């Protein structure tokens, strides 16, 4: 895999989103990875529905949190609608997939990266955007404006985001806090520190969709 990856440069990343007050980061993270894998496999960059996963992932808890792996499973076993067909409302509602016509895209499964393994995570990013988790509760993370973030932060992961690239000393993260947070909505988190958890627990739980 190469020294630099940045899926934005390869037209595989949609604009930065804002999850709002809703604890729907798990759905935003999954959707980032679906938009990426659909671009990689088909050549078209589309936006898909975080709200659909929020409403319909019966293993997640709506705005009280959820599981990126479960949302990616949901997209692999049914499919997902375009974001515009099923726009984000920032509140959990009744599942409306059946009422929104045929699904726009469908994947074939979801694989997990080996946890606590930086190279394994980098390997997946070189193939596609990956759903990752991290500790976002620290004010240092909350107030991040730019640069390669090294913390302070613990390994208490609580926030799902998406890794869309990396470099020799960082992993590139698409967050769901709007375009005004971080580096136009992104954070570069230091890698290569030798901490197996990853900086901010970044290596705790990583999933990506599979689409043949």
Please, how many helices?
5
Order of helices and strands: EHHHEHEHEEEEE
The coarse silhouette is globular
Sheet/helix structural class: alpha+beta
How many structural domains does the protein architecture include?
1
CATH superfamily: Cysteine proteinases
Q: Main beta sheet, described?
A: 6 strands, mixed
CATH top-level class: Alpha Beta
Tell me which CATH architecture applies here.
Alpha-Beta Complex
Helix content: 10-25%
Q: How much β-strand is present in the residues?
A: 15-25%
EC number: 3.4.22.2
Keywords: Allergen, Disulfide bond, Hydrolase, Protease, Signal, Thiol protease, Zymogen
Family: Belongs to the peptidase C1 family.
Binding site for leupeptin: 25
Keywords:
monomer; alpha+beta; 212 residues; two-stranded antiparallel sheet; 17% strand; Cathepsin B, Chain A; globular; six-stranded mixed beta sheet
Walkthrough of the structure:
This protein has 212 residues and is α+β, with helices and mostly antiparallel strands. It has one domain (1-212): Cathepsin B, Chain A, CATH 3.90.70. It is built from five helices and eight strands. It has helices spanning 25-42, 50-56, 68-77, 118-127, 139-142, and strands at residues 5-6, 109-112, 130-134, 148-149, 159-167, 170-174, 186-190, 207-210. The strands form two sheets. Strands 1, 3, 4, 5, 6 and 7 form a six-stranded mixed β-sheet that branches. Helix 1 (25-42) crosses helix 2 (50-56) and helix 1 (25-42) crosses helix 3 (68-77). The longest helix has 18 residues, at 25-42. The relative contact order is 0.21. One of its GO terms (biological process) is proteolysis. The active site is at 25, 159, 175. Disulfide bonds join 22-63, 56-95, 153-200. It is an enzyme of class 3 (hydrolase). Keywords: Allergen, Disulfide bond, Hydrolase, Protease, Signal, Thiol protease, Zymogen.
């Amino acid at each position: 895999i190469p020294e630099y990856v940045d899926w934005r440069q390869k037209g595989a990343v949609t604009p930065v989103k804002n999850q709002g007050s809703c604890g729907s980061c798990w759905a935003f993270s999954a959707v980032v990875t679906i938009e990426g894998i659909i671009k990689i496999r088909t050549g078209n960059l589309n936006e898909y529905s975080e709200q659909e996963l929020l409403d319909c992932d019966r293993r997640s808890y709506g705005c009280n949190g959820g599981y990126p792996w479960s949302a990616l499973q949901l997209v692999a076993q049914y499919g997902i609608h375009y974001r515009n067909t099923y726009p984000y409302e920032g509140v959990q509602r009744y599942c409306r997939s059946r009422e929104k016509g045929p699904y726009a895209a469908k994947t074939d499964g979801v694989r997990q990266v080996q946890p606590y393994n930086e190279g394994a995570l980098l390997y997946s990013i070189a193939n596609q955007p990956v759903s990752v988790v991290l500790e976002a509760a620290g004010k240092d993370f909350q107030l991040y404006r730019g640069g390669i973030f090294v913390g302070p932060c613990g390994n208490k992961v609580d926030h799902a985001v998406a890794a869309v690239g990396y470099g020799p000393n960082y992993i590139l993260i698409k967050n769901s806090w709007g375009t005004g947070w971080g580096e136009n909505g992104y954070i570069r988190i230091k890698r290569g520190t030798g901490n197996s958890y990853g900086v901010c627990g970044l290596y705790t739980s990583s999933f990506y969709p599979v689409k043949n």
